[PDB]
Design a binder for this molecule. Structure first.
Ligand SMILES: *c1cc(=O)[nH]c(=O)n1[C@@H]1O[C@H](COP(=O)(O)O)[C@@H](O)[C@H]1O
Ligand SMILES: *c1cc(=O)[nH]c(=O)n1[C@@H]1O[C@H](COP(=O)(O)O)[C@@H](O)[C@H]1O
Lengths: 257, 257
């Protein structure tokens, strides 16, 4: 039974951050997450402001921003609130629980302070979730687990993927979904976000593989497309965002009915 | 056919960074890596200077330093050059090649500018290495691949571990060894570094598991112990560093002859 995003936002077991996301996706007719892979704060903020109305989420790698400051993140939060999107830091935590707690809370980035969502690899065991959870829980944050990767040679397959799904189910108080190439859980309260998405066929020279919105959302049953270069490399990033938005939304509509 | 660290440093296929590390290990009679998990630059620099004579390597998590600057790294390098230890940033890269490249060279940390060694998870496939290599090779750096983890429920086992070893052998121009719990390659050009080490049996509250230096170096055939809290939490950190050094060094001597 396929439910709309709006309905899924009202599921009994839904995390408040997931419900906030699903509600705005429904309101704005977007299941597009912009992967804002830029190195300048000015470009990041200009993108967030211009594309804000077209996206449900903005994915960051703050560790590549050459002029990061917490004030940059303050201005980002302002735009997120104004245009209604969540902020997802793609930190891909992959260390023991005691370490990731500090990497999430502390340092120069203070990620937990501005990021609605973060994600984690499951290779260290559930301790990685337990550690992030100690920080994220009171702050009403959520976490995505990396069940599959988009890159050539990915070891996130078979039993590895299954362990990711189990770990998510076992920590549903904080884990709100997956980074994956397709649906991996049948529980509707879990979000599926998919990177490796472009309108055109291809990859890059460093192992990335691309599939289309239609394939990923329609055929593979994912919820949200994550798109970097497909948008960022366009001359007009707003036009490109709209293109990806309409693709992903219609693919979702067709799956519904 | 086991060779001393001094002999391994001279092997024809040895990477320069590994050779430099092996020679100072022999000179100083230390196969101890200090895990300097502190949140203040002052404390990082203090520990590095005080414990420098006892260690072959200092392992950092620069993303937990509340007051990182590149000047703090310039100074760390001064101490490293004075006391003769390498700097290892335990960044645990786990993203696609295109992204890790920028995370290694760029952002606020400029890791590649100051870290002799970094490490990477193998889960994304070999693109994670090819990306890092593009930055590391020009800068004369080395990389360790994460073949096994110390934590409860680690998925870095069996075929995953084998994939890590193959990935290393196929990228021997940049990969100089492994993060592992035991010897996983029979090639003497590769280093093995093992975290999860304490004199006493135990673990932490978030999935860390500990084995002793004698078990890890002696029985399991690893080269270098990585120790954080075992030293930092002791009342006398110098005496603590010396106990771990002497344990690890004696275990190496006994295995050798
Ligand atoms: C994360 C996990 C994964 O499996 N694949 C990925 O590509 N990523 C991150 O998503 C973004 C893809 O951007 P693009 O290829 O559309 O430009 C990127 O930031 C990568 O780190
Ligand atoms: C990295 C990989 C691994 O498998 N296990 C690890 O513990 N780590 C890192 O090593 C350090 C262990 O420190 P301690 O438990 O001796 O204090 C820590 O920095 C962890 O991130």
């Amino acid at each position: 039974m396929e439910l709309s995003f709006g309905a899924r936002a009202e599921l009994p077991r839904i995390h408040p951050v997931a419900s906030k996301l699903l509600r705005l996706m429904q309101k704005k007719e977007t299941n597009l997450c912009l992967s804002a892979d830029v190195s300048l704060a000015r470009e990041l903020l200009q993108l967030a402001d211009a594309l804000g109305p077209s996206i449900c989420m903005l994915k960051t790698h703050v560790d590549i921003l050459n002029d990061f400051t917490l004030d940059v993140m303050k201005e980002l939060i302002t735009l997120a609130k104004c245009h209604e999107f969540l902020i997802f830091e793609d930190r891909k935590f992959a260390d023991i629980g005691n370490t990731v707690k500090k990497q999430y809370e502390g340092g120069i980035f203070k990620i937990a302070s501005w990021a609605d969502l973060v994600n984690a690899h499951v290779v260290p065991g559930s301790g990685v979730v337990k550690g992030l959870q100690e920080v994220g829980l009171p702050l009403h944050r959520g976490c995505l687990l990396i069940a599959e990767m988009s890159s050539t040679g990915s070891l996130a397959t078979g039993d590895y993927t299954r362990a990711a799904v189990r770990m998510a189910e076992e920590h549903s108080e904080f884990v709100v979904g997956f980074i994956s190439g397709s649906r991996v859980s049948m529980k509707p309260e879990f979000l599926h976000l998919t990177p490796g998405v472009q309108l055109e066929a291809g990859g890059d020279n460093l192992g990335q593989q691309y599939n289309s919105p239609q394939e990923v959302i329609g055929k593979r049953g994912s919820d949200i497309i994550i798109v970097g270069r497909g948008i960022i490399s366009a001359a007009d990033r707003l036009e490109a965002a709209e293109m990806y938005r309409k693709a992903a939304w219609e693919a979702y509509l067709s799956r519904l009915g």
